[PDB]
C-alpha cells in the first residue's frame, strides 16, 4: 500500500464552469426514483451516477451526449413501472 | 564484512542537497542514495508500515536499475487533516517563520 | 494557470543516439529566450514536356525543420552565482561531436506548455553556435556573454514509423448507413487507404454474396 | 462484429493470466445415437434437421471452427436432455467433446464450466489490455527489454503543479506512440482529487488504428 502509480475503474466529476446559450430538460419516467429537483449532467458519467444505465431516458441522454452535446438536464416524473398509456404521460406533463 | 548503517546519514545529506538544487519547499523523496550496496530488508515486509490515515513511515527500497531510493515523505504526524503530515510543508514554515 | 503561478524554464538535453535511450546531460537555461523562430521549407521542379500543355510541378526533398534561439548568461548582477564559464561549457559539450559515436549528440528542447508543432519537445542537432563575451571582471572573469543556437530537425525513426501506419492503416474499417452504394462504401473506405480500393476488391475482400449484400449498421473493411 | 475485429488486431493471453479446467465427461452415459434416438421416438423427419441445425448454431457460437462429428444422449435422461457433442476443430486430428443440454423451437445450451485453458483476449480488449500492461511496467524490469514500459514512477512525490500535470500528459502521449502503434490516444486529462488530495486521477481516451 506504499505510493505507487496504480489502474482504476473509477471516474471524478470535477466541476464545470462552461456555460452554452441552449440547454435541454429531459423529462420523463427514469430508471430509479429521485426527489423533485433538476439534475445537471456534464457527461454519461453523470447520469450513470444518479441513474441505472437502462431504459428510454438512459438512450436517450447518452445520443444527445454522442452527437456533441456537453450540457443537460434531467427531470423524473418517476419510476418507469408507472407507465400505462398515452392519457397518463398527458396527465403527468399537466402537473 | 560490510557496515550496517541508519538511513537517517544518507537522508540528511539529500535534505541539504535538495534545499540548494531544487527549493526548502520540494519533498526529500525519490533521491536515489550513494555508496549504499543493498537495503537489510526487501520492501515486501513494509506493507504495514504505510497509514494514509495514521501513523506511518517513510521506506527505503531498492529498484531494478533505479537503485535505492527513498519513496516516502510524511512525518510522524497522523491526523487527517493537520497541516503537518509532511517533511518538506513542515520545513518550508519554519524557512518562512525563519 | 490552474494551481501556481511558478516560471518554466527551458531545458536542453542531449543523447548519443536517435531513440534517446543513452542520456549524456542537460541544461537548464538561467533566462528564456523572449522569441522563437521555427522554419519550414519545400522545394519543388518545374514539369517540361514536349507534348503536353499543363502547368504542373512535383515535390522535390524539403530540407529538415530549423530552429533558432538566443540564450543570455550573466554573473555579475545579484542572484546569479553560476559562473557564465561553466553554463557555456555545458551548452557547447552537449551540441558536439560525441567521442563515441563520432556525431553530435541528438538533442531534445522543452519549455513548459509551449509546443513544438504538435510535439513538447524538438527532436534535432545542433547546426551553429555562436558566443558573444561582452563583460569581463578585472581577472577576465567572463560575466555576460550570449549564445546564438540553430538546430536542424532530426526526429526518432520509431515515432515516424507509428504516425505514418496511424494514419494510412494497413486495413481501415467503415460503417454502413442508409443509402449507400457499394462505390460510395470504397470511396470512403479508400479515402485514408495508399492506394485506395475498388468496388470489386472491396466486395470480395468481404465476402458479399452480391455488389448489395450489405445492410444499415453493418460493418465492412478494406485492405491495402 | 467481435470478429472482423479480432482478426484485424489479434487475439493474445488476457492479462492477469487466468486458468480453467472444465468438468469431468462421464463417458459411461452416452452410448445412444442422437438420430437414432429420436426416429425411435417417433419425432418429426423435418424435426431432426432443425434440431440438427440448433446443435451446430449454438456449437458454433461457443467455437466457430468446430465441426461436428458425432452426437450422443444421456441414458439417465429419456425425455431436459443431455447430449455429448464430439467435434474436430478446422481441419485438424485433434478431437475434442462438450457436454450440452437440448431442450424441446428446439433450444441448446451448454455447460457453463467446460473450456479448459487460458483466458483470451480479442480485437479490442485486447488493445485496451496492451495498454494498462504499460502503465504498470517500469523500464528495466523486462528481462531484455529494459527500455519498455512508461515509467511513472519518476513523477511521484513531486508537487502538484501545472508543471507536473504537462510533464505526465506528454510522457504519456509519446510512451503509447513508441510502444503501442495499434492504439491512438485521443484525450488526457489530469485532476487532483478532492477527498484524496495526494492523488492524481489521469483520464485516458484512445481510439483504434482505422477505426473511423
Given at each position: 500500500t506504499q505510493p505507487s502509480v496504480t489502474i482504476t475503474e473509477n471516474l471524478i466529476f470535477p466541476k464545470q464552469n462552461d456555460s452554452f446559450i441552449g440547454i435541454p430538460v429531459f423529462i420523463g419516467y427514469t430508471s430509479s426514483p429521485v426527489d423533485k429537483t433538476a439534475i445537471k449532467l456534464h457527461s454519461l458519467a453523470d447520469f450513470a451516477r444518479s441513474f441505472p444505465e437502462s431504459g428510454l431516458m438512459y438512450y436517450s441522454v447518452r445520443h444527445f451526449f454522442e452527437n456533441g452535446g456537453q450540457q443537460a438536464y434531467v427531470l423524473s416524473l418517476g419510476t418507469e413501472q408507472q407507465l400505462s398509456d398515452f392519457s397518463s404521460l398527458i396527465t403527468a406533463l399537466q402537473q | 564484512?560490510?557496515?550496517?548503517?541508519?538511513?537517517?546519514?544518507?537522508?540528511?545529506?539529500?535534505?541539504?542537497?535538495?534545499?540548494?538544487?531544487?527549493?526548502?519547499w520540494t519533498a526529500p523523496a525519490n533521491i536515489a542514495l550513494s555508496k549504499?550496496?543493498?537495503?537489510?530488508?526487501?520492501?515486501?515486509?513494509?506493507?504495514?508500515?504505510?497509514?494514509?490515515?495514521?501513523?506511518?513511515?517513510?521506506?527505503?527500497r531498492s529498484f531494478p536499475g533505479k537503485g535505492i531510493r527513498i519513496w516516502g515523505c510524511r512525518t510522524l504526524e497522523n491526523t487527517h487533516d493537520s497541516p503537518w503530515s509532511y517533511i518538506q510543508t513542515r520545513r518550508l514554515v519554519s524557512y518562512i517563520e525563519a | 494557470s490552474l494551481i501556481e503561478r511558478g516560471l518554466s524554464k527551458l531545458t536542453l538535453t542531449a543523447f548519443k543516439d536517435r531513440e534517446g535511450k543513452i542520456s549524456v546531460g542537460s541544461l537548464q537555461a538561467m533566462y528564456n529566450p523572449d522569441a522563437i523562430q521555427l522554419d519550414?521549407?519545400?522545394?519543388?521542379?518545374?514539369?517540361?514536356?514536349?507534348?503536353?500543355?499543363?502547368?504542373?510541378?512535383?515535390?522535390?526533398?524539403?530540407?529538415?525543420?530549423?530552429?533558432?534561439?538566443?540564450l543570455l548568461f550573466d554573473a555579475s548582477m545579484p542572484g546569479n552565482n553560476i559562473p557564465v564559464e561553466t553554463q557555456l561549457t555545458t551548452l557547447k559539450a552537449l551540441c558536439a561531436v560525441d567521442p563515441s559515436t563520432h556525431v553530435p549528440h541528438f538533442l531534445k528542447i522543452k519549455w513548459g506548455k509551449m509546443?513544438?508543432?504538435?510535439?513538447?519537445?524538438?527532436?534535432?542537432?545542433?547546426?551553429?553556435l555562436t558566443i558573444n563575451y561582452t563583460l569581463f571582471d578585472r581577472d577576465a572573469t567572463p560575466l555576460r556573454a550570449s549564445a546564438t543556437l540553430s538546430l536542424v530537425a532530426d526526429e526518432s525513426f520509431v515515432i515516424q514509423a507509428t504516425e505514418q501506419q496511424l494514419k494510412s492503416p494497413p486495413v481501415t474499417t467503415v460503417s454502413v448507413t442508409d443509402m449507400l452504394t457499394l462505390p460510395l462504401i470504397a470511396l470512403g473506405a479508400g479515402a485514408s487507404l495508399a492506394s485506395g480500393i475498388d468496388y470489386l476488391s472491396l466486395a470480395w475482400q468481404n465476402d458479399l454474396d452480391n455488389l448489395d449484400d450489405f445492410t444499415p449498421g453493418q460493418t465492412l473493411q478494406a485492405q491495402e | 462484429t467481435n470478429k472482423i475485429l479480432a482478426d484485424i488486431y489479434g487475439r493474445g493471453w488476457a492479462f492477469p493470466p487466468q486458468f480453467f479446467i472444465g468438468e469431468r465427461i462421464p463417458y459411461e452415459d452416452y452410448s445412444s445415437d442422437l438420430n437414432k434416438y429420436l426416429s425411435e421416438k417417433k419425432i418429426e423427419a423435418e424435426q431432426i434437421v432443425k434440431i440438427q441445425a440448433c446443435i451446430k448454431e449454438s456449437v458454433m457460437c461457443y467455437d466457430f471452427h468446430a465441426k461436428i462429428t458425432s452426437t450422443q444422449v444421456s441414458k439417465q435422461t429419456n425425455l431436459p436432455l443431455n447430449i455429448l457433442v464430439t467435434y474436430t476443430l478446422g481441419d485438424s486430428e485433434i478431437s475434442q467433446k462438450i457436454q450440452g443440454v437440448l431442450r424441446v423451437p428446439p433450444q441448446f445450451s451448454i455447460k457453463d464450466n467446460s473450456r479448459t485453458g487460458i483466458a483470451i483476449a480479442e480485437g479490442t480488449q485486447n488493445v485496451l489490455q496492451s495498454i494498462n500492461i504499460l502503465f504498470l511496467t517500469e523500464p528495466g524490469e523486462r528481462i531484455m527489454r529494459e527500455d519498455y514500459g512508461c515509467g511513472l514512477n519518476d513523477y511521484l512525490f513531486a508537487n502538484i503543479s501545472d508543471e507536473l500535470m504537462t510533464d505526465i500528459q506528454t510522457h504519456i502521449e509519446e510512451r503509447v506512440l513508441r510502444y503501442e502503434p495499434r492504439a491512438e490516444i485521443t484525450s488526457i486529462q489530469v485532476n487532483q482529487r478532492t477527498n484524496l488530495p495526494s492523488t492524481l486521477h489521469v483520464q485516458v481516451t484512445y481510439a483504434l488504428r482505422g477505426s473511423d
Open positions: - | 564484512n560490510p557496515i550496517v548503517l541508519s538511513p537517517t546519514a544518507a537522508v540528511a545529506a539529500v535534505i541539504q542537497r535538495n534545499d540548494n538544487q531544487q527549493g526548502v549504499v550496496i543493498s537495503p537489510v530488508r526487501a520492501y515486501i515486509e513494509a506493507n504495514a508500515l504505510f497509514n494514509p490515515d495514521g501513523t506511518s513511515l517513510n521506506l527505503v | 519550414y521549407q519545400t522545394h519543388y521542379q518545374q514539369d517540361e514536356s514536349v507534348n503536353h500543355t499543363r502547368k504542373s510541378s512535383h515535390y522535390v526533398s524539403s530540407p529538415p525543420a530549423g530552429l533558432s534561439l538566443v509546443r513544438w508543432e504538435n510535439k513538447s519537445y524538438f527532436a534535432g542537432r545542433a547546426s551553429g | -
